Design a protein around this ligand. Structure first.
Ligand SMILES: COc1ccc2cncc(NC(=O)[C@@H]3CCOc4ccc(Cl)cc43)c2c1
Lengths: 305, 300
């Protein structure tokens, strides 16, 4: 029993964290094979960062300008290139600790673990979801740039995020490992504001199923709803629309708990209009939206990595 | 900026997880140097669960009764001993991945990361606190026994917990890495119930300071209180008494935020009095008690 916000074991990712220094700037890098990946703003001064020409700043760089440190050992850079907002530093040594990995771009609502690092050294690991507005509600201080977000599939690390910046509201913005920003963000000190956030409905439903599995049933009700009626209510409360794909994905949990997806939707519908009434679900007084259906199944079935 | 429940990177601990099998029972073990540590109930049968005699069951065992598996490689056990509720299996190979480590016993309110494993393989990592009643509110299925709780304070892994059992209320009981149970629990299937749990007050105050640091101030007030008046209110909500030591510990946060400890105590008094009024502190609608003053300073 028990339900926790659980991150993937970070070991395979820790073995890839290096410190990248370019001039006065020091952030983290991801060392996979003979390439180190890091945000391209490492080649930026506070003068440059207002309106930076990265293609121009990078042509003025030589391989020795990048100090790459893997532990106490300093790696030598033999090539430098840029793909979108990520810098790629070709190195002379392949990382012996390189795991089976792949670069994946995630969709909103999807969750991942973050391995927060400072000076190429991992300091913490936490779980978070890609918000529907494309920001992550992370925990990042100065120097955390280059920290990566990942998921583990069997024995394969799927790298899906690299941290670049923090918005004025305390939320964070980053890119996939191909340098493509998540959302409408740019990698420069400019006026940028996250759009109005919405609740990830399929995850709230997955989390209600996890609560039922752990014996919390007070919120269950005799009612069911149509997918259309639920969505009309969901919009009114700033909840993401629930598609037929979300209903299909929630299928195994529906079968394991004997509570049809549209039956759980009517429980969620009552919770939104009426509230908790001083009660909690899984020790929480709010509807949690940071557990995907595959997360709930993985935690309640004991899938190992 | 930002405030999350953050676990320590589990890498150093993953490299120590092995599968220990004794007859029909299979749980996890912690392989440090040439010793594998695991709960002593791996040597119990169906008949030996209500009142097993472990000293007697262990003398009837031989090294070749313990199947220790590190990855696909099967380790050879060359000695077996018991220290309190933990079994120590001396092996012929030292773990190449053994980190700088130390065994520490924690006190209620202290937090640590748990590396949940099944069949010697890490499935997940999460953060939790040692409850004032000495149980942990973990996430554990059958086979997670031997999973360890730890804190990585600069390069060194402090092992402070090993999972042993699940109480009838869904909460968990375990020991330090010296086999000493946390609380009044025994490693028998006899009727055991956790005492009524209480909120870790110093942790709620530390968490309110973290919220102020991150710009959340709606809960603040013009009031201050005596430490005695605060404690009388606290017990009425099942909150742990706040000692002078807790006030001292909250000193750096009080200085960083310019909000005296007894001033925050009056904010907490008011929060207990009215509740949240549909508002949240750090994205939560309840007062979080699984962040210590040390975690709040570290994370911020
Ligand atoms: C369905 O069985 C479970 C489910 C979740 C579980 C989560 N953590 C641990 C489990 N095991 C136990 O607590 C064993 C089962 C029998 O009762 C005792 C009594 C004493 C001792 Cl030391 C161990 C145990 C779990 C066993």
């Amino acid at each position: 029993s028990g339900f926790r916000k659980m991150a993937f074991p970070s070991g395979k990712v820790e073995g890839c964290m290096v410190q990248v220094t370019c001039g006065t700037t020091t952030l983290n890098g991801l060392w996979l094979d003979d390439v180190v990946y890091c945000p391209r703003h490492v080649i930026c001064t506070s003068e440059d960062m207002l309106n930076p020409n990265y293609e121009d700043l990078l042509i003025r760089k030589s391989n020795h300008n990048f100090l790459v440190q893997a532990g106490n050992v300093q790696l030598r850079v033999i090539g430098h290139s840029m793909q979108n907002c990520v810098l790629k530093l070709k190195v002379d040594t392949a990382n012996p600790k390189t795991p089976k990995y792949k670069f994946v771009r995630i969709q909103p609502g999807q969750t991942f673990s973050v391995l927060a690092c400072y000076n190429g050294s991992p300091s913490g690991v936490y779980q978070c979801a890609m918000r529907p507005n494309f920001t992550i509600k992370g925990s990042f201080l100065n120097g955390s740039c280059g920290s990566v977000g990942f998921n583990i599939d069997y024995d394969c690390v799927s790298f899906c995020y690299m941290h670049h910046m923090e918005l004025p509201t305390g939320v964070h913005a980053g890119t996939d490992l191909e340098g493509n920003f998540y959302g409408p963000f740019v990698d420069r000190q400019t006026a940028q504001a996250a759009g109005t956030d919405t609740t990830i409905t399929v995850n709230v439903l997955a989390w209600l199923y996890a609560a039922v599995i752990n014996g919390d049933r007070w919120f269950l009700n005799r009612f069911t709803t149509t997918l259309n009626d639920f969505n009309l209510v969901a919009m009114k409360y700033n909840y993401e629309p629930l598609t037929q794909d979300h209903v299909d994905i929630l299928g195994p949990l529906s079968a394991q708990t004997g509570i049809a997806v549209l039956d759980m939707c009517a429980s969620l519908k009552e919770l939104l209009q009426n509230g908790m009434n001083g009660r909690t679900i899984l020790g929480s007084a709010l509807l949690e939206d940071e557990f995907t259906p595959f997360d709930v199944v993985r935690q309640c079935s004991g899938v190992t990595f």
